[PDB]
């Protein structure tokens, strides 16, 4: 029986992987210049929420 904990863990793994994927994409696009990198604008809280 899959209760709230396994159901939310399954639901959350993919969302966290999507957050990592978007951080990778944005960071790569911004670091192709090689200038700098900042985390706080590279993380989209809306994904998980």
């Amino acid at each position: 029986l899959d209760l709230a904990g396994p159901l939310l863990a399954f639901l959350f793994r993919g969302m966290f992987k999507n957050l990592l994927k978007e951080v990778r994409i944005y960071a790569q696009k911004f670091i192709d210049r090689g200038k700098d990198f900042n985390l706080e604008l590279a993380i989209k809280t809306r994904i998980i929420s």
Binding site: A4, A9, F12, R13, K17, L20, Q28, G34, F37, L39
Partner: protein, 86 residues
Amino acid sequence: FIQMSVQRIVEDAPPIDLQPPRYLLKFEQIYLSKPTHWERDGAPSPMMPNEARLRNLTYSAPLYVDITKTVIKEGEEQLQTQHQKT
């Protein structure tokens, strides 16, 4: 789930690898607080379930994670900058 599984999911995720200089991202620990409003002026306030029911709010709590960012500039010094409560 909240106590074990979120930490396990965050930790078991592979470290982000990126690149010239090379950058690595690691997630150290997660922290959860009591449910709180983000009121429209930004002011914190504990949100009661009755108020969440009445105002059509969502009874949720913010999630913070410590992130360590290591930058390698090939100069033998890899600078790590840790960020608390991201």
